[PDB]
Design an enzyme around this catalytic site. Structure first.
Site, PDB file in Angstrom:
ATOM      1  N   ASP A  99     -17.609  35.721  60.517  1.00 12.48           N
ATOM      2  CA  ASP A  99     -16.199  34.396  59.956  1.00 12.48           C
ATOM      3  C   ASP A  99     -16.311  33.637  59.833  1.00 12.48           C
ATOM      4  O   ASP A  99     -15.949  32.848  58.975  1.00 12.48           O
ATOM      5  CB  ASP A  99     -14.928  34.604  61.660  1.00 12.48           C
ATOM      6  CG  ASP A  99     -14.737  36.239  62.284  1.00 12.48           C
ATOM      7  OD1 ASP A  99     -14.427  36.276  60.374  1.00 12.48           O
ATOM      8  OD2 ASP A  99     -14.439  36.242  62.819  1.00 12.48           O
ATOM      9  N   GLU A 129     -14.653  34.663  56.373  1.00  8.61           N
ATOM     10  CA  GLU A 129     -13.443  35.109  57.038  1.00  8.61           C
ATOM     11  C   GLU A 129     -12.468  34.915  55.170  1.00  8.61           C
ATOM     12  O   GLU A 129     -11.971  33.426  54.935  1.00  8.61           O
ATOM     13  CB  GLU A 129     -12.701  35.263  57.873  1.00  8.61           C
ATOM     14  CG  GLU A 129     -11.476  35.580  58.449  1.00  8.61           C
ATOM     15  CD  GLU A 129     -11.672  37.239  57.957  1.00  8.61           C
ATOM     16  OE1 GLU A 129     -12.709  38.259  58.964  1.00  8.61           O
ATOM     17  OE2 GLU A 129     -11.608  38.115  57.018  1.00  8.61           O
ATOM     18  N   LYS A 179     -17.976  43.194  71.066  1.00 10.99           N
ATOM     19  CA  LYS A 179     -18.442  42.647  69.809  1.00 10.99           C
ATOM     20  C   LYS A 179     -19.680  42.707  69.805  1.00 10.99           C
ATOM     21  O   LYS A 179     -20.046  43.208  68.463  1.00 10.99           O
ATOM     22  CB  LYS A 179     -17.008  41.345  69.409  1.00 10.99           C
ATOM     23  CG  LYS A 179     -15.766  41.320  69.215  1.00 10.99           C
ATOM     24  CD  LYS A 179     -15.777  41.474  67.490  1.00 10.99           C
ATOM     25  CE  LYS A 179     -14.917  41.215  66.817  1.00 10.99           C
ATOM     26  NZ  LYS A 179     -13.963  39.320  66.829  1.00 10.99           N
TER      27      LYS A 179
HETATM   28 CA   LIG Z   1     -13.786  38.834  60.330  1.00 10.97          CA
HETATM   29 CA   LIG Z   2     -11.701  39.832  57.666  1.00 11.07          CA
END
Ligand SMILES: [Ca+2]
Ligand SMILES: [Ca+2]
Length: 200
Positions: free
Chosen positions: A113, A85, A139
């Site tokens: 991430d 990320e 998610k």
């Molecule tokens: Ca992300």
């Molecule tokens: Ca992002």
């Protein structure tokens, strides 16, 4: 109290690198940080959590997982986490591809991430203003197939993570929850919170 601007809160309460990375992410997707302001603050928060999740965690000279809070670690120590990320799409996928070929881990269908070199898995981090179980299910159902670990934080201290596996020690996750509490409290004092909470 007087109503502050979320813009003001973001620039005053997040470090400039986070803010800049957040602005860049929004631009990349066609969103303007000055209109989707709650989103701006959410993206900053989520970025900071990703950084705090990886902060201090290394793999030692012998290859096990250790925590060092110095500002100058031992230079033979390897960072435990890769941070995906915050990178633009090209570099994010470049990093994901590099990890996957090396470690032989499966390639994810969406950018995650983090990557955890100890647990040998990608991590999807989430930060929610709603109940963690609902956000968790959203998610899980997006990622389709899974080796990717999910870890959800809320602003009220609840967590939910894949298979009840929380990856980090209590102290590390406490740092994160403390930061989220502080963000919530500060928004509240500027009368930004109820709206921010309701916008997710
Ligand atoms: Ca992300
Ligand atoms: Ca992002």
């Amino acid at each position: 109290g007087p109503l502050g601007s979320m813009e003001d809160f973001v620039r005053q309460c997040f470090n400039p690198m986070i803010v800049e990375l957040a602005e860049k992410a929004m631009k990349e997707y066609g969103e303007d940080p000055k209109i989707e302001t709650n989103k701006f603050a959410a993206i900053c928060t989520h970025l900071e959590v990703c950084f705090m999740y990886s902060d201090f965690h290394f793999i030692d000279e012998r290859g096990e997982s250790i925590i060092v809070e110095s500002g100058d670690p031992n230079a033979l120590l390897k960072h435990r986490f890769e941070i995906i990320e915050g990178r633009d799409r090209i570099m994010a996928w470049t990093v994901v591809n590099s990890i996957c070929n090396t470690t032989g881990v499966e390639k994810p269908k969406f950018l995650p991430d983090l990557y955890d070199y100890k647990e040998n898995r990608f991590i999807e981090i989430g930060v929610t203003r709603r109940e963690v179980h609902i956000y968790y299910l959203e998610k899980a159902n997006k990622i389709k197939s899974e080796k990717t670990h999910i870890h959800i934080f809320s602003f009220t201290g609840e967590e939910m993570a894949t298979k009840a596996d929380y990856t980090l020690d209590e102290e590390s996750r406490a740092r994160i929850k403390t930061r989220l509490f502080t963000i919530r409290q500060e928004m509240a004092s500027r009368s930004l919170w109820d709206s921010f909470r309701q916008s997710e």
